[PDB]
Amino acid sequence: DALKVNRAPVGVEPQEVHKWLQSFNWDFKENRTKYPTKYHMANETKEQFKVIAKEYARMEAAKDERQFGTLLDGLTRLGAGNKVHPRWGETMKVISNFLEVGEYNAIAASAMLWDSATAAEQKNGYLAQVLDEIRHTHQCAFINHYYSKHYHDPAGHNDARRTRAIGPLWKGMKRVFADGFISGDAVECSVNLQLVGEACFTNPLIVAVTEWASANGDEITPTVFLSVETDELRHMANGYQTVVSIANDPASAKFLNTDLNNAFWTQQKYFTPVLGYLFEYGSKFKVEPWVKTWNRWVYEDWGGIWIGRLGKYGVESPASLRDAKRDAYWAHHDLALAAYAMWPLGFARLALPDEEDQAWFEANYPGWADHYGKIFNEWKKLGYEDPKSGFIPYQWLLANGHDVYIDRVSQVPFIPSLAKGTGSLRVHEFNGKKHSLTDDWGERQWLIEPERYECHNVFEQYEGRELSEVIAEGHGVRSDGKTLIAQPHTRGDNLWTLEDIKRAGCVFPDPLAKF
Amino acid sequence: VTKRGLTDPERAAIIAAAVPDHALDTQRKYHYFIQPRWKRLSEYEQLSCYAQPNPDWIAGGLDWGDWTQKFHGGRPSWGNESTELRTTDWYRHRDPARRWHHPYVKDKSEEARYTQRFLAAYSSEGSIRTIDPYWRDEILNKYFGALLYSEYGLFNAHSSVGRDCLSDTIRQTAVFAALDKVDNAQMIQMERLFIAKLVPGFDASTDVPKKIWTTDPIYSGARATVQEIWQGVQDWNEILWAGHAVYDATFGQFARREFFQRLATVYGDTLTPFFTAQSQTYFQTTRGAIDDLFVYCLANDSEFGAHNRTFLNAWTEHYLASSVAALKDFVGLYAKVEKVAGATDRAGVSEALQRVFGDWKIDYADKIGFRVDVDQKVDAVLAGYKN
Amino acid sequence: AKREPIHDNSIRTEWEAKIAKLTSVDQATKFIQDFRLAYTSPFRKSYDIDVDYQYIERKIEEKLSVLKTEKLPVADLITKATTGEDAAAVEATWIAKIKAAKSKYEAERIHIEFRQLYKPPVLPVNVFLRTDAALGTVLMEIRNTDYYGTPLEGLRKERGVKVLHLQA
Numbered sequence A: 001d002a003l004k005v006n007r008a009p010v011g012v013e014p015q016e017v018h019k020w021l022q023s024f025n026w027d028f029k030e031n032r033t034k035y036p037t038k039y040h041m042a043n044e045t046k047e048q049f050k051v052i053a054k055e056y057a058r059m060e061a062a063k064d065e066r067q068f069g070t071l072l073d074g075l076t077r078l079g080a081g082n083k084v085h086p087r088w089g090e091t092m093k094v095i096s097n098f099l100e101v102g103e104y105n106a107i108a109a110s111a112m113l114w115d116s117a118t119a120a121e122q123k124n125g126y127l128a129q130v131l132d133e134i135r136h137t138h139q140c141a142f143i144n145h146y147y148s149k150h151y152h153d154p155a156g157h158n159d160a161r162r163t164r165a166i167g168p169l170w171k172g173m174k175r176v177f178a179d180g181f182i183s184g185d186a187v188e189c190s191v192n193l194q195l196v197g198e199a200c201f202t203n204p205l206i207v208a209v210t211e212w213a214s215a216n217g218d219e220i221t222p223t224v225f226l227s228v229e230t231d232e233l234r235h236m237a238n239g240y241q242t243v244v245s246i247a248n249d250p251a252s253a254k255f256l257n258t259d260l261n262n263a264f265w266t267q268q269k270y271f272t273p274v275l276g277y278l279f280e281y282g283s284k285f286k287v288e289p290w291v292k293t294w295n296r297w298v299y300e301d302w303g304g305i306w307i308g309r310l311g312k313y314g315v316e317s318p319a320s321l322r323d324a325k326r327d328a329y330w331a332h333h334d335l336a337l338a339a340y341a342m343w344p345l346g347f348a349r350l351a352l353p354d355e356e357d358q359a360w361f362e363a364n365y366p367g368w369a370d371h372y373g374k375i376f377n378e379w380k381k382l383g384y385e386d387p388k389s390g391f392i393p394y395q396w397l398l399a400n401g402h403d404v405y406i407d408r409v410s411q412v413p414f415i416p417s418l419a420k421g422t423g424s425l426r427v428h429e430f431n432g433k434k435h436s437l438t439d440d441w442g443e444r445q446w447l448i449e450p451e452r453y454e455c456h457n458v459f460e461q462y463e464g465r466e467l468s469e470v471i472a473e474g475h476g477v478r479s480d481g482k483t484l485i486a487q488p489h490t491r492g493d494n495l496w497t498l499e500d501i502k503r504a505g506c507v508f509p510d511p512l513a514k515f
Numbered sequence B: 001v002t003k004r005g006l007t008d009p010e011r012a013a014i015i016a017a018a019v020p021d022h023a024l025d026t027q028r029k030y031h032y033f034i035q036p037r038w039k040r041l042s043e044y045e046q047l048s049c050y051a052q053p054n055p056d057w058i059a060g061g062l063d064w065g066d067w068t069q070k071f072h073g074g075r076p077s078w079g080n081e082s083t084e085l086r087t088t089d090w091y092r093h094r095d096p097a098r099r100w101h102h103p104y105v106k107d108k109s110e111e112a113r114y115t116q117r118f119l120a121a122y123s124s125e126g127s128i129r130t131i132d133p134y135w136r137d138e139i140l141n142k143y144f145g146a147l148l149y150s151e152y153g154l155f156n157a158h159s160s161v162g163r164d165c166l167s168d169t170i171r172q173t174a175v176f177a178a179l180d181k182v183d184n185a186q187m188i189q190m191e192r193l194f195i196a197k198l199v200p201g202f203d204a205s206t207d208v209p210k211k212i213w214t215t216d217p218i219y220s221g222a223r224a225t226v227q228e229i230w231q232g233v234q235d236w237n238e239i240l241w242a243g244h245a246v247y248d249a250t251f252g253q254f255a256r257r258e259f260f261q262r263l264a265t266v267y268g269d270t271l272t273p274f275f276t277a278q279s280q281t282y283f284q285t286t287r288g289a290i291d292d293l294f295v296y297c298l299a300n301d302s303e304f305g306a307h308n309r310t311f312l313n314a315w316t317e318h319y320l321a322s323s324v325a326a327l328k329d330f331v332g333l334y335a336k337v338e339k340v341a342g343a344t345d346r347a348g349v350s351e352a353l354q355r356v357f358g359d360w361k362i363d364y365a366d367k368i369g370f371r372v373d374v375d376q377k378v379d380a381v382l383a384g385y386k387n
Numbered sequence C: 001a002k003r004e005p006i007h008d009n010s011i012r013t014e015w016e017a018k019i020a021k022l023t024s025v026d027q028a029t030k031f032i033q034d035f036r037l038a039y040t041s042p043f044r045k046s047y048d049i050d051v052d053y054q055y056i057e058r059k060i061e062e063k064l065s066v067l068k069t070e071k072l073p074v075a076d077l078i079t080k081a082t083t084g085e086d087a088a089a090v091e092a093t094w095i096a097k098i099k100a101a102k103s104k105y106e107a108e109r110i111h112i113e114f115r116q117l118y119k120p121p122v123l124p125v126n127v128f129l130r131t132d133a134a135l136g137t138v139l140m141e142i143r144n145t146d147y148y149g150t151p152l153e154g155l156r157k158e159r160g161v162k163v164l165h166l167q168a
């Protein structure tokens, strides 16, 4: 009554509220996902982390305070933003912004999954991921924001959201980390984002990114991405629960391993070579060959352990896993060829492997020296680094029959005459348009699904235009309006200008005209 | 221990020799080229703006070409087909609160921790002893409980918005608005769970509240509106407008502020105002951002303003009628409460409705050129007040 | 030959000239449908403006959508295609078409064509999106059945490509 009440101090803990969450949803005929899908996520699917809105915020705010303390107080006092090796400081312009678009699109992908789920707990797991991917978007931004303030070359750290549009390396990133996350069956997007991008690739990504960064004097990136890792553990649990939620739908047995095989090939096709390249070539000090990192996490831990436990819900190991393992050894070296050859279309300053780097490459990738090593040394000899040389190696490739093609599906560059990786050129004409495909899995995707894969490539956009005009149009210059953001060396002097590019006369051809 | 280039002598020396003795550019403002909304470019705009990789054929985008991978059939990753409204730049929107992820979770974390200290102390105080028992058990537990399903339904209407919408700042506004709505629903349940610890026999199960939400006439109008805004449409601007600017600003404001918060301070309820304080704080934060999107950016677009106001007026006409009927159904709850002159009598409900509709006319209707006769709306709803 | 700049060129400019002459909803509807049939999807009639058609499409959309709000009664914005057809009737027609499709090649062309003909502003956004989602569900179910059953050699003949080069 009005005089006697239990006055023990009590609150309400998150899991006390969370146990009633499933009952917040109610039945009505129109309570059904809006997105096209072959699958139905089960009504009673639970989630693993019993988090409510207030507990989510408390959790993450506490992570932020630690992270921002380290960055804005301690690392600034140390001057650590300019104690990064230039090779690595340049590589983070690309690594952080490319990863940022994967964080950003993962907000939209997680919302789409939230829409596909019918159980309130499953919607809630995806919602927590929606919020985290906003956090991660702004964390990647904050890396490049901080470099822009404290590192000796802010250009490209300070404008990648527009300067990325100049180059072909960004197109491939959009497939794996943007479009591959949000365009298709929500379940296909889930295996792209959660079962593969997160449960397969986010552990090796974070371990490698933070280990390569700290090896090269970068303590900004470990501070952020070690915080990102704590969130990403929960997202792998979302990918697991997507497979659980559809396990008893008969459509799962018809379709799921097709979506997973396609998604795994999609992710590995670019994620494998682009990170391998950015790590080993954008570094001075070497940590562990990317191939070993890929083997341990992708082949053994994910393809073995993760995929194995998922057999309880009908998951098979991807048929394209063998082909992807052969790619993991050479495909990033192949990509390095194109990335160095087309350096003026990027937004980072590049360094050819020195003698120590070449010994490292040859010792861990025996065969590198006689092939890539000879090529890189020839380019250096021809004036790769020298702004008076009129030399850009993309033109050397053309002169010597080493044509560059773009996979219509993955946007990954392909140089068949020099590639040691998996893959082979197929050139088809369909309805008055020529298409280059570069592997059995993507070619199947294009032949069955031609309307999903209509991306214009850089040779089609830039055909017959001169390189310096393309760069200037795309704002690929420093604040003086003439010096390039991108450079073929990491020294403080003899930086290339639009005029030095124009001297070379690089004009884009149509690589398929000959077929 | 692993070697670190910051502290390892050999590597620190190699790095120091490699670092040039001067900056290679003086432009240190991250994404300097964003057009600032206010006097100086803000951290909020730097971290958020142009994260979305739109091409030039989605208004405002900086990229080019088709998407790399589209839906079966050809639906683009993001496309102009996603909404009826049109603008010269989808990136124009700015949250006046300037919320990127960090300040957003920082503020809600304060509320998260302070709430539990409050509850531990309120239970220690014994302050529940003075609540009107009829209010506590027959009105608050049942009908405030049932109201969580409005907040929850409004939360879920955002799922397709988060997927479909066309810019980064808009995406941030919608996702934070969504979390705040499911927060409201979870806080209503937290309050009921809390009381169940202080009042023996008080049932905090959602059974009866859900029964009320799904079948009681008092909520059938609101439920029909919520079901339509959530699962009936996919135009993500329609969802945002109908959700926050019409339904939640009329029905939801009346239910939360004029009924449960106001009448709590008429029936001796020292607890519920702590919880409605948070939902109403979230309402005003959400309103600032909704207002900027639909008023500043869309209704006043230099090329498509008249166009967009045509659709906004048509949506408002429709969703206002739905909300008026929701309130007509709802004010039948007054027949269940103890009479309090000036609060629960017909005059009192009239003034409550005049505030809600009067404020709405100022806050929303007049800004898009939607004509509304406040007395007509008040009288329409009051027709549901029992004699 | 030589491409013009990405965002400002004579092709985009010439098409904006044509778009400005559109003065009625019927005329603009015929224009955008002829445009999408001629220049969008893998079954387009022409790739001549491949790198400009998507932006040009956006401008046609903006013109037709403004003509709709200026010319049509508000109810027609909600219920009708700008063809004058009832939007729910179009949805019914096309959902039924794709459900009677007998192969993935049949279904894909029904779905693509529905988008070329009825993409907003022609069809109301809400009707269009739920029709597109229903069609996509059916197209995926048929495409993703026995997805690896046909060898690449056979898939090429089914798709009808002209094979110009196969490496190695």
Ligand SMILES: [Fe+3]
Pocket (backbone or CB within 6 Å): A103, A106, A132, A133, A136, A228, A232
């Ligand atoms: Fe993430």
Ligand SMILES: [Fe+3]
Pocket (backbone or CB within 6 Å): A106, A133, A198, A232, A235
């Ligand atoms: Fe994630």
